[PDB]
Structure formats: structure tokens, C-alpha cells
Design a protein around this ligand. Structure first.
Ligand code: LPE
Ligand code: LPE
Ligand code: I2U
Ligand code: I2U
Ligand code: CL
Ligand code: CL
Lengths: 702, 702
């Protein structure tokens, strides 16, 4: 293995001169506007087919290989949807039939507009809690039992419609890339804090206590206080039933995971528990005997369309944005796992449109907002679901319950529903281990997990999320705030330059400094960069320039007085031991000491690093060349270029050659727009590599 | 010029093996605690001298060269401080003597604790507006015309004390670097919007109209409606006087800038206008004759110390955080200008401590918050100010007015003070030109400017700033969100690799792809990076792996059937035209096709890119080596590392050798903590440069 190279030393300009470029186009935004104005029938076709995905997947359905799978998966998911709809309607604090509406409408809409083939569309616990909190606030801000339920049901429907409107708007504006602004640490911390929120929310049903409609901030603490202050009023029958169901479901749930091979089909413990709980409750007349809360009678059939309330929209708009983003983020994440697994394209923009339309329709018909539940989606997929036909079948199961078999669920205890929801919390609850994992791998990510968790707990799920996204953006600045700048040296007398402090027997060419900032330089960075560069070269170039300008002034003074006489050969100290009086420039004249030194007046050059006439003294510097390794400087901003231009001008005015190496062509293209180059800062300072600049410097000094 | 290199090809591990590394001394956090816990006698001296800068600069005072200069600067600044205090107390909507308190107390405290030598400490218009808005809100949120003034004075004093407490806390915690989080575009947009706010705030005094205490959001609009709704009630005498003063001052101000060379000393148009205005008002009895609003009778003396109100603290903590941050940012910017001009160190933490103590004392003695006015600081410096003795003499002038000669300012109209404040707006209002300039230079900074302006106009100064800082952090993600990734090729047949689309006669070694991402890869980035890499290589490695696994499965099945035999020379097709039978794997078995292929059962090796038996087909790829140019990848985060590892694992599983080049040693050190390396992803994939990896690949293929 030999790395052997023989080429010219290349400055970036010299390289462009010797190597012809290719034609480039600006791709004017007007051109983008031009392309948008296509109207080609094929484009129209693709667009409509993009907006109505069912017209493409339905016709290509493999009936023989997919129908039975979707039918079986649909029945399974349909049952889960019914029970989860009831439970999550409890979480919204409205009658449980509206959870059935929330499990029905969004899914039917998704069948026509969704691009995912595996998610089960409907409510999930975090969004139901967020909707319930939005409702409590809306009601509290409304200028003046069943009546209270009516108001909550109306506020929930309005919140749902506004969330769907926001989602649909974001999908029409093609901003489905917003999910990228959420890191995995943020999602982990947020979902752990949200699992704690859900746990606390189920306590009023486990104990059967009456808890006020608390709002954020610190609603979780407010609820905990409400639950524990009145803990003696707890219904024992509710608690025991909840404990038994929770204990049994968890034991059986683990068995399914451990013994997947041994089992022909997983035991459906959650379904078995509800049927048994409902049967026993009905059989032993638990509602009368132990005064247990039960699901109760639900009137069959759907509600008539409700008009969204504009007053509610004004009151809850901030909440709705949080609800819309959370709904989209969760759905997209769940969908992504499946699309990747099954190798099909998932369109983020279409998902926003589909989820948004589903929500608007659901809200109008009195259901609450939901996108997808990870547990329900897993069931649809694990039971063999192939397409969104499984989702349609599931919706039909929900419809049957809503229209004909709703009465069967009447004797089911609320605590049992709450206990099932608690069982699903374990996956999310196990995310506490991530803090330790993150701590070893990356402190910034660990900080993000912790801040997100704290923000989600103290402020609510919605406000906490906004604060968490802001803090996670701030950590990007934390990462690049104090870059580990370095001085580089040559290793092995070849073209390799590394940290001057890392290896033995390194070599700096005499009078050359090579400085590296391993980060992009911008507003939060450039002062630190200047401090580190001045520490690396060992002096401040502006201080040196000011001391030289002062000396030049004294020299000119003595020259005019006569004590000093100019000469082709240096200077004449006509008068020895001369006077010692400083000019003491005023506040309005001191700026002259910062101007480029011009000594043309004097015929000869003043070597500023050699002795000066008449004891005049100025710090001497050995630096004649400064190389800035800009390979890791990704971008620059106006502050960095202003600061940069400033630093470079100062080095150049003190006769030190400056070289910027390791940048690409886009970089110099960008730097040309900033009006960076002029006289006394030229594009000649850019070289290809550190070794190009070093060899150029050595030839100059030769 | 000739770049001539002859060295070995170096993998990062090989280079380290061949070049001994120096002592890697880790820095223990406990050790930091140890160094922080030194308590040496000299260290104590340095700390106390740091907290009491006066004990350091006073003894070194050059009486002969500074005394007179500081005296003249002090008298000049003291006069400006009196008038600016009265005007800015108008902006706080309290009696104007509290502006005199605000000009007195913080300057006296800063004399002892400040590190700057040129700023004039006291109120400025933006902070007075912010304090006035905080008071209005506090008053409203309080639970149940002198009394109104009394309530407003108490709330202003409490807001001042809490702002000072926050500043002092930030200074003790050594967080004076927070100033870096404000870009120049943000500051420009914010100060232009704040100048518009100040302009609108002066209209009730120019016209002499009664305006309610409007709060934010959109307070600027609320006030404008109130002003022009009553425009008919305008006092003309006030207006005319204001216009004349504003006109004369503006014209003469211009002359001072234009005729500095011809002028021995700047004309004091603001003082002359104030003296003439007050004289005519008294002489012609303007208060009675034209019913004009005058400054009125101020009672001489200071107020007794007042106790901060905790209720006001609770109601204003957020406004007080905003006030503290704005005060420190303004003071530090002005002080940094002057400390760079005169080359002396400026301690930001000490600055935070001094301003906090000054604000605490001012608020206790019924003044309001203030850090420094650029207009007054410039006067102190321009008039010859050398040390903070000029600030002491200015505070003595303010004291003389408060105690003895305040009655002289009784007949001065408020419209004149408002007109004087308007004169100072010109510098900030001309910043509107920045939009066009920044548009040409950098559209992200133009966006920061415009959004800061809009946030500060719509929301207020405090909330606008918070929203603007958040948006400016979001623009950093906007910059690095969709990196312009590229494929590189060789130019010149030497170690230079550039964008494959930029030059003619470039060369890619056959089967090698070189991909560059010119940005750090983090969470908002890695999905885009994967998409671009898959577009660059021309296939998805996971799709190729899944198809090969399917082929292998069919093969093994046919081999089981016997229809296929195995030879070191290939596969025997005893039976041809096989019955195609896709296994149609179900949802729970499909993940097997994503696993590393282990065809060790077979004696030979299946050239996956040659033709397979019985028409078994798999997409063929020409890629055998992928080089990732990571020179501009500053940092990685957990999401990016996970995404990176997944990508690499997939490429390795389809037998594509992967190389990462151009990183430094800190990078690999960091990557070792993420548990990135294991079997099948080794540190052998890191090479020094692109040419090292290319030459290694070529030797492997030889
Ligand atoms: C016939 C009677 C109807 C029964 C149908 C009910 C539906 C029964 O299906 C449940 C199975 O899908 C098992 O679910 P999983 O394997 O996804 O369990 C994972 C649990 N976590 C951890 C994801 C929460
Ligand atoms: C003795 C009699 C009274 C003396 C009072 C002297 C009052 C002080 O005189 C002010 C002069 O210094 C002029 O100030 P500048 O040159 O800084 O003007 C700049 C204006 N802007 C653009 C910054 C607003
Ligand atoms: N398989 C699986 O994971 N399941 C769940 O997670 C369920 C639930 O979470 C809830 C029901 C009510 C509130 S939560 C669930 C229900 C049924 Cl009927 C069948 C499977 C189920
Ligand atoms: N030189 C300069 O810039 N000056 C200003 O900007 C002044 C003011 O802004 C105000 C006075 C009252 C309300 S504002 C000012 C005042 C005086 Cl007496 C002398 C110079 C001044
Ligand atoms: Cl779930
Ligand atoms: Cl000012």
C-alpha cells in the first residue's frame, strides 16, 4: 500500500482555472412556480390518485390471499376498538358511547384517504387525555349532570373538528415533514411522562372517586391530591376487581411474549377478562350490591351532526395544535414501522389529509380525536391484516355494537376498563431505563430525555411538549456553543495534519499556525471562535496593529522634529536618549490606531519585528501565515461572516498571510453573496487542503 | 509548485498503531470541583477584587490625565440623565421624579461593582416601556388618581426589584454568556419593532390624549386606535411645540454629524430646546393659557425605602425575566462596543451582578429598572469620559436636581420630552434597510429579522423576544434540515475528489460510490440522509437483502425437493422449469428476510450478481464499496448514530464494504460511547482521507 501523489499545489481559484466547470442552472423559484403550472393530464391523474389512494390499492386486491386475513384481523381489531373506545371516552370524561363514535368515523374515512395499510385508526390514551384537558379549559372559559355532559360532549366535538382542520391545513400545505422536529429522546421522555399521566388518570376509576376537572399546569399533582385526600371513600369492590383483572392480564400477557413458539395463537386475555367481568357483574348484580360504577345503558344509534362552536375554537386553538401534532406524530411513527417492514411507500402529506378529514368527520358526528393506538395497530398487524379492508371490517364490528349489541356492555365496570388501560402502560413505563443508557452514550440526549420528562410532568402534555421541542432545539446550540478548537501539526513529514497535542514528534513549519474549528460558525459561536484563535496564535492582532500605529506616529513625530532622519538604509537616530512623551489620544481620535499602516512616505520598509529607532518598542510576533482548517465548518451566518471578515482584515493589516482550506465550492459560492471578498481580502486565500497551503507558504518563504 | 507525497495508505487504526499517541489525561468532574475548591489566599484576593472592581481601578486613577475629562463628561451625561429620566418615567406612566430616582441609584451602585468604564447606567426607552407594560398587567391581576399612581409606583418598584434579583442570580451562577443566544438579525428586528413601539407610545403626549393602559398581545394596535379615535380632542399647542422641537433637533443633529471637522464642539440642541421650551412655557404661562401638560411640581427629596410586594412578584415573574434579559443584553452590547474600542476586559458575570444590585437598590428606593441608554453612553464617551467617575458626577447632577433645583423643570411640557425621545429613534428606524441587505446576503437571517419584527409588533417586547429567540433557534434546524448531499468523483487522477456534477472528465472507480453530507447528522437530518444515500447508490440495500433471502429460501426448498443439487461448480438443476411458489410469508414470519445471509451450508459461494438457478431472480448491483465523506459532519446524536448503524449494517449484510473518511479523533472517541462498533461494524471502516479509502479498495480488488 502506497499513497503516492504528484500534482501542482492548488489554490481553489487555480483549480477552477485549470479544470473547466460544467454549466449550472439557478433553478429559479419562478421555475419552480413554472413547473407547478403543469396541468398535464398525467399529472392530474397522479394528483387525484394521490388524494384518493383507495382507487389504486383496492383494484389490486388479492382476494384469495388477503380477504380471510383482513376479515380475521378486522374482527379482532374491531373488538379491541370497541373496548378501547369505551375506556378512552372515560379518559375524555364523557359518556362512553362517544368513544364508539371515535372508533367508527375516523376509520371509515381513512379507508378512503389513507396510505398506510396496517394502522388501526381511532382513539388512544394520550390524545384522549389531551382532549379532556382541552375540554376542561374550554368549559372554564365559557362566558355564561346531563347538562354538564352535554357541554363537555359539545366541547370535545368542537376540539376534534378544530384539530382536524389544523391537520388538513398542514396536509394541504405539504408540511408533513414536521415530525422530523421530534427526536427519539424527546419522544421517549414525553411518552414516559404521558404514561405517568395516564396512570394517574385511571385512579379515579380504580377507586371510584369523584375528582374535579383539573387543568394544567401541574394537573397531575392536582389530581393526585384529589385522589389521595379522599382515599378513605374508595369503593373496595371496584378496587379488588381492578386489581384482579390487572394482575391476571399482566401474567398472561407475559406468557404470550415468552411462549410465542409454543402457542398456536396468543391467549386473548383482555377479551376474556372483560367478558368474565361483565358476566359476573351482571350475574351477581354488582351495581346494586356493591355500588360499582358500570358502563351503563348507551342509547343505540349515532347522534345527529353537530355544528362546531366558534367560541370553543377561540378558547382551545393552542390545545388543538398540540393535539393535531401529537395525533400526526404518533400515527406517522406507527405507520413507518409497518411501511418499512412491508416495503411500501407511506406519504406523510396524505396521512395529514386523511387523518384530518377523519377527525373533522368524527368531530361533526360527536366522536373525539384520535389517530392510531400502537397496541391496536399491533393487533391488526399481528393477526394477519393485509390492507385497510381489515380496518373497514373493524369499523363494522364497532357499528354493530353501536346499533345492536351495545346493551351487552352495560354491566361492565369502569374499573375493569381502567385496569386494561393500565396493562398497556408497561411498555411505556419501561422507558425509564433509557436515562441510564442515554447517560453513557450522549449527555445532550440524556438531558433531552430528562427535560422532556420534567416539562411533560410540571406543565401539561401539550404545553410540556412545546417547551420540550424548544429545549431540544436549544440543545443543538449547546452542542456547537463551545467547539473544541485546535492547533494542528504535521505528523510523519507527509500530508497528514492532526491535533498538535495528540501525538509525539509532530512538526509545525516555523511561523505557521494551523487552526481548526470542528463546527459550523454562526451567531452563537463566533466570539468563542475569535477567543480561541487569539489564544492559539498567542497574541491579539488588533492590539499589535494599535501598538504599531502608535510607534509609527512617534516615529513620524521625531522625523518631523528632526531627532530622526529617514534613509535608504533604515533610520538615523540623530538624537539619542530622546524625549518620552505619549500622544495620549482623545476618545474621538483613538480610532486612528486601527487603520491599515501605510509607510510609503518613508522610502524603506519597516521590519516591525526588528528593533525600532530611538527605543520605540512594539511586541514582536513570529507568525507570518495562518491557516484556517474549515472542513468541518458546515455553514456560516451573517454574524459569523461579519466576525470572520473582521478577524481576517486585522491579521492582513498586520502582514500575516491567511489561508482558508478544506471547504467545498458551495461554501465559496455562499461567501460571495455576503460581500465578503474585496480588496485586502481576496478569494486567493482559499486553498484545497492544508498541505496545499503549507507548500504554497514554503515556496513563498523560499 | 509541486505537491509530492509518498506515504502508506492509512486506516485510522493503522495510523494510530504506527504513531504513538500522547498521554490522554481525562479531566474528572470531581477534579474540576477540586480546582474550583482551592481557596488559596491569592485566589481569595482575585475573587474579591473581581466582585469589587473599584478596589482595582480607583487606585490606578490618573488624576492628571482624567479628572477634568471625567468631570466634563459627567456634567454632560448628568444633564442628559435628568431629562431622559423624566421622559422615560413618562414612558412608565408614573410621576416623572421616579425617573430621577432611576437615573440616580443604579449609577451609584455600578460605580462600585461595574467593570465597564464608559456606559452611563440608568433607564432607556425600551426597558421603560417593558416596565410600564409589566405594571399594567400586575395591576390588573391584583385582587381587590393619586391612588392609581401610587399603585403603579409600587408595582414598578416591585418589578424592578424582581428584575434585579433575576440578574443577580444569573450573575452569581456565571451565566453571562446568554447574550450569545441573540443574533444580530434578531437584535436588529427587535430594536426596529421596539422603536415603532416607542413612537406609538409618544403619541399620547404629542397630542395630549388620555389613553388606557393596554396590555399585550397587540398592545401597539390597541393604543393607536385609542389615540386616533380621540384625535379630535388633540391639544394643538402641545402638538405644535413638539413638532418644532422635533424639527429643530433633527436638523441640528444632522449638522453635528456632517460638520464635525468644522465644529470645535457639538451643538447641544436637546438641552437648548429644553431650556427655551420651559422658559416660554413659564414666561407665557402655557399651562394655563393653552392648557398644556407640564412636568409639574415634584416634591424634593427621595422616598423612604419600600418593601417589595410578593403578589406583584407572582403576577410579573415572566415580564421580569424578559426585563432582566433585555437590560443585560443592551448594557453588555454597549459596554462591549466601548471595551473593544479602548481595549480593556469586560466581565459579563460581574456585569450581571452590578446591574442586579443597582436594580434592587433602585426598586427599593422607588425607581424603575434600567441598564444603559446608547444615546447617553455615547455622550459620556464622546464628551471625554475616561472612568466611571463620570457616572458618579452625573449621578451627583441628578442628586442636585432631586434635592435642590427640581422646581426649574416644573413648567416643562411633556410634549417636549416626547419630541426629544422621538429624535433618538432615527438610528433604529433606519434598520428597515437591513431587510433588503439581508435578503441579498442570507435569507435565513432575513427571515429572522422579519419574524422578530412581526413577533415584537404583534406580541409585545417581552413575549415577542421569547418567540423570536425560539424561531431563531428553529432557523438553525432549517439550515441543516435538507443538506445538499453529493456524490464525489476524482478529478485529475490524483487525491482530489469533487462534486461529480461540477466538472468535466471526472472519474469514479468502477463499483465505488463516494457520498458526501455537508452537515452534521442529527435527528432532524438522518431520514433525509438515508433517502439521499439510497438515491445516490441507486438501490435500497434492505430491499436487495430481502430479495436475496427470498431467493435463498426458494433454493433451499428446491434443494430439499432434490430438484436442485449442489456442486463446487454451481447448482445442478435435475428438474428445470420449477413451479414458482412464493412462500407468501405471513405478518409474523416476514422479518426472517431481513437477516444476514449465511449460505455456509452450501460448499461454494453464490455470486448474487451472476445468474441464479431455475430463473430465480434477484436485482443485481455493481456497487462493492461505499465511501462516506464525513469531514463536514460536525457531530452525531443518538438518533443519527442509530440511523447510521442501521444503514451500515444493511450495506454490510449485502456485502458492500463501507468506509468512513475525513473525521477527526474526537469523532471516533464519541462514536465509541454510542456502542456503535461491534462484530460486523468495526473501527476498520475509518480511513484518513477519500484517497486512502480508494487506494485501499483498489488494492483489495487487485
Ligand atoms: C375470537 C374472540 C375475539 C378475540 C379477539 C381479541 C384480539 C386478540 O388478539 C390479541 C393478539 O393480537 C395478541 O396481541 P399482541 O401479541 O400484539 O400483544 C402485545 C401486547 N402489547 C405489549 C403490545 C400491549
Ligand atoms: C454645559 C451646558 C450643557 C451641556 C450639555 C451637553 C449635552 C451633551 O452634548 C451632546 C453631544 O455630545 C452630542 O452627542 P453625540 O455627538 O453623541 O450625538 C449623537 C446623537 N445620536 C445619534 C446618538 C442620537
Ligand atoms: N391485544 C391487546 O394488546 N389488547 C389491548 O391492549 C387492549 C386494551 O388495551 C384495552 C381495552 C380496553 C381499554 S385498553 C385489548 C382489548 C381486547 Cl378486547 C383485546 C386485546 C387487547
Ligand atoms: N446627544 C444625544 O444623543 N442626546 C439625546 O439622545 C438626548 C435624549 O435622547 C433625550 C432627552 C430627553 C428625553 S430623550 C439628549 C439630551 C440632552 Cl440634554 C443632551 C443630549 C442628548
Ligand atoms: Cl396504545
Ligand atoms: Cl437610547
Amino acid at each position: 500500500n502506497q499513497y503516492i501523489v504528484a500534482r501542482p499545489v492548488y489554490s481553489t481559484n487555480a483549480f477552477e482555472e485549470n479544470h473547466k466547470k460544467t454549466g449550472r442552472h439557478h433553478k429559479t423559484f419562478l421555475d419552480h412556480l413554472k413547473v407547478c403550472c403543469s396541468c398535464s393530464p398525467q399529472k392530474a391523474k397522479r394528483i387525484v390518485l394521490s388524494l384518493f389512494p383507495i382507487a389504486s390499492w383496492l383494484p389490486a386486491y388479492r382476494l384469495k390471499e388477503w380477504l380471510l386475513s383482513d376479515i380475521v384481523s378486522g374482527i379482532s381489531t374491531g373488538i379491541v376498538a370497541v373496548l378501547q373506545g369505551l375506556a378512552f371516552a372515560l379518559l375524555v370524561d364523557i359518556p362512553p358511547v362517544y368513544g364508539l363514535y371515535a372508533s367508527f368515523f375516523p376509520a371509515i374515512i381513512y379507508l378512503f384517504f389513507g396510505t398506510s395499510r396496517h394502522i388501526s385508526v381511532g382513539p388512544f390514551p394520550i390524545l384522549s387525555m389531551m382532549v379532556g384537558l382541552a375540554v376542561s379549559g374550554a368549559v372554564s372559559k365559557a362566558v355564561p349532570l346531563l347538562d354538564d355532559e352535554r357541554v363537555r360532549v359539545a366541547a370535545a366535538a368542537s376540539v376534534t373538528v378544530l384539530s382536524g382542520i389544523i391537520q388538513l391545513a398542514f396536509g394541504i400545505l405539504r408540511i408533513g415533514f414536521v415530525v422530523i422536529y421530534l427526536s427519539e429522546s424527546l419522544i421517549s421522555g414525553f411518552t414516559t411522562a404521558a404514561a405517568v399521566h395516564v396512570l394517574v388518570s385511571q385512579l379515579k376509576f380504580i377507586f371510584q372517586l369523584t375528582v374535579p376537572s383539573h387543568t394544567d399546569p401541574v394537573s397531575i399533582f392536582k389530581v393526585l391530591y384529589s385522589v389521595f385526600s379522599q382515599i378513605e371513600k374508595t369503593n373496595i369492590a371496584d378496587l379488588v376487581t381492578a386489581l384482579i383483572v390487572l394482575l391476571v392480564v399482566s401474567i398472561v400477557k407475559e406468557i404470550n411474549q415468552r411462549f410465542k413458539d409454543k402457542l398456536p395463537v396468543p391467549i386473548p386475555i383482555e377479551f376474556i377478562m372483560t367478558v368474565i367481568a361483565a358476566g359476573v357483574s351482571y350475574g351477581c348484580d354488582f351495581k346494586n350490591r356493591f355500588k360499582v360504577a358500570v358502563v351503563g345503558d348507551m342509547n343505540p344509534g349515532f347522534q345527529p351532526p353537530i355544528t362546531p362552536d366558534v367560541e370553543t375554537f377561540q378558547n382551545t386553538v393552542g390545545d388543538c395544535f398540540g393535539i393535531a401534532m401529537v395525533a400526526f406524530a404518533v400515527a406517522f411513527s406507527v405507520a413507518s414501522v409497518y411501511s418499512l417492514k412491508y416495503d411500501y411507500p407511506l406519504d406523510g402529506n396524505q396521512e395529514l389529509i386523511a387523518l384530518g378529514l377523519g377527525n373533522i368527520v368524527c368531530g361533526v358526528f360527536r366522536g373525539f380525536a384520535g389517530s392510531t393506538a400502537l397496541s391496536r395497530s399491533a393487533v391488526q398487524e399481528s393477526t394477519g391484516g393485509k390492507t385497510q379492508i381489515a380496518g373497514l371490517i373493524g369499523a363494522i364490528i364497532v357499528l354493530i355494537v353501536v346499533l345492536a349489541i351495545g346493551f351487552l356492555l352495560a354491566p361492565l365496570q369502569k374499573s375493569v376498563l381502567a385496569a386494561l388501560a393500565l396493562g398497556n402502560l408497561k411498555g411505556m413505563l419501561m422507558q425509564f431505563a433509557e436515562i441510564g443508557r442515554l447517560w453513557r452514550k450522549d449527555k445532550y440526549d440524556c438531558l433531552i430525555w430528562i427535560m422532556t420528562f420534567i416539562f411533560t410532568i410540571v406543565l401539561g402534555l401539550g404545553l410540556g411538549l412545546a417547551a420540550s421541542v424548544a429545549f431540544q432545539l436549544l440543545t443543538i446550540v449547546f452542542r456547537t456553543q463551545f467547539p473544541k478548537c485546535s492547533t494542528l501539526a504535521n505528523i510523519g513529514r507527509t500530508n497528514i495534519y492532526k491535533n498538535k497535542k495528540d501525538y509525539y514528534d509532530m512538526y509545525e513549519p516555523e511561523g505557521v499556525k494551523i487552526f481548526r474549528c470542528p463546527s459550523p460558525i454562526y451567531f452563537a459561536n463566533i466570539g468563542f471562535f475569535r477567543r480561541k484563535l487569539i489564544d492559539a496564535v498567542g497574541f491579539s492582532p488588533l492590539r499589535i496593529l494599535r501598538k504599531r500605529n502608535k510607534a509609527l506616529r512617534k516615529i513620524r513625530k521625531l522625523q518631523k522634529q528632526g531627532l530622526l532622519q529617514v534613509t535608504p538604509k533604515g533610520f538615523i537616530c540623530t538624537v539619542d536618549t530622546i524625549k518620552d512623551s505619549d500622544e495620549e489620544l482623545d476618545n474621538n481620535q483613538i480610532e486612528v490606531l486601527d487603520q491599515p499602516i501605510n509607510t510609503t512616505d518613508l522610502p524603506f520598509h519597516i521590519d516591525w519585528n526588528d528593533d525600532l529607532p530611538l527605543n520605540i518598542e512594539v511586541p514582536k510576533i513570529s507568525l507570518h501565515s495562518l491557516i484556517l482548517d474549515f472542513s468541518a465548518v458546515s455553514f456560516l451566518d451573517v454574524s459569523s461572516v461579519r466576525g470572520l471578515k473582521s478577524i481576517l482584515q486585522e491579521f492582513i493589516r498586520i502582514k500575516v498571510d491567511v489561508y482558508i482550506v478544506g471547504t467545498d465550492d458551495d461554501f465559496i459560492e455562499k461567501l460571495n453573496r455576503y460581500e465578503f471578498f474585496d480588496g485586502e481580502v481576496k478569494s486567493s486565500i482559499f486553498f484545497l487542503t492544508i498541505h496545499d497551503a503549507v507548500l504554497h507558504i514554503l515556496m513563498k518563504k523560499d
